[PDB]
Ligand binder design. Structure first.
Ligand SMILES: *[C@@H]1O[C@H](CO)[C@@H](O[C@@H]2O[C@H](CO)[C@@H](O)[C@H](O)[C@H]2NC(C)=O)[C@H](O)[C@H]1NC(C)=O
Ligand SMILES: *[C@@H]1O[C@H](CO)[C@@H](O[C@@H]2O[C@H](CO)[C@@H](O)[C@H](O)[C@H]2NC(C)=O)[C@H](O)[C@H]1NC(C)=O
Ligand SMILES: *[C@@H]1O[C@H](CO)[C@@H](O[C@@H]2O[C@H](CO)[C@@H](O)[C@H](O)[C@H]2NC(C)=O)[C@H](O)[C@H]1NC(C)=O
Ligand SMILES: *[C@@H]1O[C@H](CO)[C@@H](O[C@@H]2O[C@H](CO)[C@@H](O)[C@H](O)[C@H]2NC(C)=O)[C@H](O)[C@H]1NC(C)=O
Ligand code: NAG
Ligand code: NAG
Ligand code: NAG
Ligand code: NAG
Lengths: 135, 441, 98, 49, 49
């Protein structure tokens, strides 16, 4: 929506980054954003115990991670997590492959925003919950 | 300047005293950060991947070092705050010998249980503007000027959220304050054991060389002085907008480092330009490889310098955090005898409060005043036997002699159960004659 | 050699506090501790005879006041001998600073 | 002119270097200056031998 | 030549910044010792003599 001046052609932001450009034909200033990307983290309970892992995409809402894996061309072993089998959106991006219980416990494997993940035998799996300070 | 009327038989003794509230601030953690390698180095080009992988896995060292810094940060914060294994709740009754506590106690009537003073600090800083990706990735359509944090994120420089959120930190501070208000310092050793506040204050005065009888007889004055001090510190902190300094210094330092790094991207490095696609397409591979090599080397060197500087600042923050933890463990959970270590003057107690990137201690102390002149002597010889005080000193307004304490004028008569004897009275240098009392005669 | 370093841009700035006023602070602190014991650390200065302060400090380390009033001369003599010895030792070895 | 390509690099160096310059003064001021007044001994001096 | 000299200056600045923190720690220790063992009597053994 931000307006230009009749002579003004394209916008720039601090640290010489291009943000918005006026189209030559319609003379309307459209906004340009860098393509989606991020970092991946692997939540693991230990090789000796189990082989079930959770994945964490940092700093992004993951309504678009299945397409991210489709374009990045990772194996269907990654596409299974790209599909929303078990998706939870925390403050630190989102985690895929972990059920979110509604009770509280202590913390063993940190993630962020005061949310932890741990392996529990009920139906052994990788649960994810909210930190509890103590009794 | 201030001269002193020194002598060899004169002594001054304070008559009155005051309670003052002192404030101090300590940083405990910087902002954690991460870094992307390939998108920073040249910005999404395949030839980059083809040409830089043989330069070495330097970004592996970068990632591991910066991850070590990140984990050290939340290690510091959890070591400095998480020192109580329970959570303590104040009772609905809030009468403590007339000691008002509305300002610092947590407020149920507020979103998030953040007390008044810490709310005041949080609104005084108002320069972090969160920035810990409070569900970021919403700056896709930048109708506004895009700010600065999103742009810094879009150059491969991310920031991770801290492990501990603010409200749980506030809960920890509330637990500490409740424990130190309701059960003395016993909860520092084991399970909390309740003691009424007045006798806890009596204990603390008994710690600093003064007997309980001074407190139980002047409770109302103590309450009034305490409340007035709390109001005064409220007003003083609300007034000045530049009393913090250190936290702003840390934030500005980190911002300057990031800004220098992002500005360094537009260096020519003795080459044609800072553009990648033009240099690759216009030139031919034999010279394009030379130019790309020079750019990569320059940018790697700059990134290495930034990493080293961040590593350096981490150690200073670590030292400050360790000292803060020691002070929190000693001044709060006990009563330190180290002068000028938990506030000026004799120390009574301290309360902690949270702050967006650190802690703030309120020290409640003791300060004598209204001194008076008197004449003294080391001992009194009676019936050829010297006599020395039990714990006080001998004083006299000119006519009669008395034993008194060392920080509050309170005369008493020279009785045989308030002194002791050693040898004859021909050896000491300042003997003065008087009488003594035996109560049973 | 300082001039040569200067003509390469390696300017050395002078410290804000000159030595004389540093000595003035040290003398003020020494006067405070000699004439007022410790009370001037917390509040204002309070005069008190020196023997009283030494008796207090002995009372601190597990010894009653009745050791000082009949050992004053020995205390003074040993103190003076020790301070003369420290003067001589400091004047002798120039490598103890390190 | 060629350093202008590197631009404010030594400006950054100066900004970094001034910090320790002020820090030294802060250190000395903190370590010594901790007295509100400037006392002085009485002219007559006999401190019990 | 420019790059080499700039690199040398940078490493010198880094080394000086390194020494500054050590001097800061020593100054903190000295301030603590003067505040404790001069303005009062310390119960800690071997902290002061
Ligand atoms: C010690 O000082 C306090 C205040 O500095 C004195 O209390 C004040 O006394 C005056 C005299 O009547 C009153 O007008 C004030 O209202 C008192 N203040 C408070 C807070 O109650 C106190 O009297 C002094 N102690 C002695 C023994 O004189
Ligand atoms: C502790 O001090 C606070 C200071 O605000 C007192 O709060 C005041 O309470 C009165 C009671 O009617 C109100 O009229 C005021 O408006 C309150 N102050 C403010 C700024 O709103 C509190 O009452 C004191 N504690 C006790 C037990 O009296
Ligand atoms: C020194 O203080 C003592 C104690 O307060 C004074 O002695 C008493 O003074 C009152 C008031 O004049 C008399 O009613 C008492 O009879 C006195 N008691 C005794 C045992 O004499 C004394 O007057 C004060 N002296 C000076 C010079 O101030
Ligand atoms: C304290 O009282 C005693 C007792 O009178 C004084 O001792 C006298 O000292 C003189 C000095 O030679 C002798 O001549 C007297 O014989 C002593 N008295 C007795 C009863 O033998 C002593 O001087 C007094 N001290 C002070 C400081 O007044
Ligand atoms: C991602 O989550 C945020 C926060 O809940 C929301 O505002 C946004 O609309 C989500 N993304 C999409 C594509 O819906
Ligand atoms: C979890 O518990 C909260 C209680 O505040 C409730 O609001 C929420 O619906 C619960 N969610 C599930 C999935 O049980
Ligand atoms: C105090 O010192 C002065 C000066 O030396 C001396 O004249 C006086 O006798 C001393 N006081 C006593 C009680 O000896
Ligand atoms: C004690 O006496 C001296 C000398 O007469 C005087 O200078 C000093 O002010 C007196 N003390 C007080 C507290 O007034």
């Amino acid at each position: 929506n931000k307006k230009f001046l009749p002579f003004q052609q394209f916008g720039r932001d601090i640290a010489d980054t291009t943000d918005a450009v006026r189209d030559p034909q319609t003379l309307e200033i459209l906004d340009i954003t860098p393509c989606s990307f991020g970092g991946v983290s692997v939540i693991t309970p230990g090789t000796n115990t189990s082989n079930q892992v959770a994945v964490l995409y940092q700093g992004v809402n993951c309504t678009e991670v299945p397409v991210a894996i489709h374009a990045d061309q990772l194996t269907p072993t990654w596409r299974v997590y790209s599909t929303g089998s078990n998706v939870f959106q925390t403050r630190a991006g989102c985690l895929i492959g972990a059920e979110y219980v509604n009770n509280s416990y202590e913390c063993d494997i940190p993630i962020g925003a005061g949310i932890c993940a741990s392996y529990q035998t009920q139906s052994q799996s990788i649960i994810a919950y909210t930190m509890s300070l103590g009794a | 300047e201030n001269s002193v009327a020194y002598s060899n038989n004169s002594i001054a003794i304070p008559t009155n005293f005051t309670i003052s509230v002192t404030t101090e601030i300590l940083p405990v953690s910087m902002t954690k950060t991460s870094v992307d390698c390939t998108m920073y180095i040249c910005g999404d080009s395949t030839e980059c991947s083809n040409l830089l992988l043989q330069y070495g896995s330097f970004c592996t060292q970068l990632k591991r070092a910066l991850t070590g810094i990140a984990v050290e940060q939340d290690k510091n914060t959890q070591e400095v705050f998480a020192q109580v294994k329970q959570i303590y709740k104040t009772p609905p009754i809030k009468y403590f010998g007339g000691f008002n506590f509305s300002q610092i106690l947590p407020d149920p009537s507020k979103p998030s249980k953040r007390s008044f003073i810490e709310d005041l600090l949080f609104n005084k800083v108002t320069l972090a503007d969160a920035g810990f990706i409070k569900q970021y990735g919403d700056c896709l359509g930048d109708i506004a000027a895009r700010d600065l944090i999103c742009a810094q994120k879009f150059k491969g420089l991310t920031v991770l959220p801290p492990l501990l959120t603010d409200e749980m930190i506030a809960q920890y501070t509330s637990a500490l304050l409740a424990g130190t208000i309701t059960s003395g310092w016993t909860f520092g050793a084991g399970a909390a054991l309740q003691i009424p506040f007045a006798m806890q204050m009596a204990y603390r005065f008994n710690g600093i060389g003064v007997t309980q009888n001074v407190l139980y007889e002047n409770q109302k004055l103590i309450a009034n002085q305490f409340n007035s001090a709390i109001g005064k510190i409220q007003d003083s902190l609300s007034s000045t907008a530049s009393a913090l300094g250190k936290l702003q210094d840390v934030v500005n330092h980190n911002a300057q480092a990031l800004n220098t790094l992002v500005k360094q991207l537009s260096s020519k490095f003795g080459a044609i330009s800072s553009v990648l696609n033009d240099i690759f397409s216009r030139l031919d591979p034999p010279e394009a490889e030379v130019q790309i090599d020079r750019l990569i080397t320059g940018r790697l060197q700059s990134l290495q310098t930034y990493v080293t500087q961040q590593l350096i600042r981490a150690a200073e923050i670590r030292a400050s955090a360790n000292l803060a933890a020691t002070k929190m463990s000693e001044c709060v959970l006990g009563q330190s005898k180290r002068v000028d270590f938990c506030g000026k003057g004799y120390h009574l107690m301290s309360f902690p409060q949270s702050a967006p990137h650190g802690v703030v201690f309120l020290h409640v102390t003791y300060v004598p005043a209204q001194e008076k002149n008197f004449t003294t002597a080391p001992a009194i010889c009676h019936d050829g036997k010297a006599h020395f005080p039990r714990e006080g000193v001998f004083v006299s307004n000119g006519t009669h002699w008395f034993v008194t304490q060392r920080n509050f004028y309170e005369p008493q008569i020279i009785t045989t159960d308030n002194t002791f004897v050693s040898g004859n009275c021909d050896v000491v240098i300042g003997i003065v004659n008087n009488t003594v009392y035996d109560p049973l005669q």
